[PDB]
Amino acid sequence: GMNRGKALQLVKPHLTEHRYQHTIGVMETAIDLAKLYGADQQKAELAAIFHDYAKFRDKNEMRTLIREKLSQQDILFYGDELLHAPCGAYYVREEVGIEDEDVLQAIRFHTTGRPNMSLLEKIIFLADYIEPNRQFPGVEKVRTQAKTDLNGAIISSLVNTITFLLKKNQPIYPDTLATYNQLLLEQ
Amino acid sequence: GMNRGKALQLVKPHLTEHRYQHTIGVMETAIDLAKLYGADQQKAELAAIFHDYAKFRDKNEMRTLIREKLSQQDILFYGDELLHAPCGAYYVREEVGIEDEDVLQAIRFHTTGRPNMSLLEKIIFLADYIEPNRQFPGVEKVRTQAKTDLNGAIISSLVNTITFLLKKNQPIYPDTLATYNQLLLEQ
Ligand SMILES: Nc1nc2c(ncn2[C@H]2C[C@H](O)[C@@H](COP(=O)(O)OP(=O)(O)O)O2)c(=O)[nH]1
Ligand SMILES: [Fe+3]
Ligand SMILES: [Fe+3]
Ligand SMILES: [Fe+3]
Ligand SMILES: [Fe+3]
């Protein structure tokens, strides 16, 4: 890892003020969930600070990176918002020197999720959704649910996200539904 | 193929009045969609009459048939409603002697859909959803859409289906989402 203040200082120039504020919220929320569920709070903190590092990077450069250097090529068919998580994990490793594989994995899957996520991945996934600045409808219920049921809170978040994409007639990454089904079948 | 009268004589004994009205509704809607989109109206009629042949068959026998005789085993993880289409396609061939592969596929995929459905599969899938006795919320828009945009009506139906399943926290068959995505991405 690395110093919190330096980390925040490094990410901020890559974010709008609104997104920087979001990042602080995710950080605070990730730490709290890390405490509550026995996750490493420092890895949670760091993954939270850099989760949106690539949010505003050039989309053509990011699609090229996926094609030329990264693993899951199918993401290219399912929406430009799917770029930043995987590309960010790559860029933070290459541009900042974060090599903590746990931290990078949590960044990598924070947008789509994946079946059988690690605790740290789940914490960042959910923190992103329920951080205090978010105003998606029904968030309060998910926040409350998060206090006692991490997986259930994640299921609830996925329902809201997938519902929204359907209403907007946008494509839905198949591994996001696989996450919903996996967690649901886990009960 | 078998004519309407004979086909109906074979399904009627296991149809309540509501189910009989469903059959006729699907049958007439399918014919109209066939007329509209240049599909075979006799195959549309026949597939419609038999689409729900296995609806009220023994669910344990059906699960066993999926296990012993059929290809897709994963269907058994996503709800009892997914049994009757593939098993019905099987039973109609074996018991009724219908070997028309176009008719049988239309029966097989009418509940879940698949990416890259034939026109006849699309007509039966959609006819089931928009037949006049169906009262699901938003149906009227879907019926209007169907008069001009078959793929769009099917997208709208999937949106309402998947949305409902998400809201009730039910497992969603992945190939149903693949269907949505395929039709969406093609337009
Ligand atoms: N196509 C598709 N889009 C998705 C999926 N999951 C999330 N999204 C989209 C919906 C939102 O517009 C966007 C939000 O991105 P995020 O990484 O979760 O949050 P943020 O980066 O906006 O803070 O991601 C998904 O599974 N498929
Ligand atoms: Fe993000
Ligand atoms: Fe975020
Ligand atoms: Fe059916
Ligand atoms: Fe039916």
Curated annotation (Swiss-Prot), chains A, B:
Reaction(s) catalysed by this chain's protein: P(1),P(4)-bis(5'-adenosyl) tetraphosphate + H2O = 2 ADP + 2 H(+)
EC code(s) of this entry: 3.6.1.41
Keywords (A to Z) from UniProt: Hydrolase, Iron, Metal-binding, Nucleotide-binding
PROSITE patterns: HD (PS51831)
Binding site for ADP: 22, 52-55, 84, 110-111, 128, 134, 171-176
Annotated HD domain residues: 19-133
Gene Ontology molecular-function annotations: hydrolase activity; metal ion binding; nucleotide binding
Source organism, top-level taxon: Bacteria
Residues where Fe cation binds: H22, H51, D52, D128
Assembly, per entry: Homodimer.
UniProt similarity note: Belongs to the Ap4A hydrolase YqeK family.
Its biological purpose: Hydrolyzes diadenosine 5',5'''-P1,P4-tetraphosphate (Ap4A) to yield ADP.
Protein name: Bis(5'-nucleosyl)-tetraphosphatase, symmetrical
Protein species of origin: Halalkalibacterium halodurans (strain ATCC BAA-125 / DSM 18197 / FERM 7344 / JCM 9153 / C-125) (Bacillus halodurans)
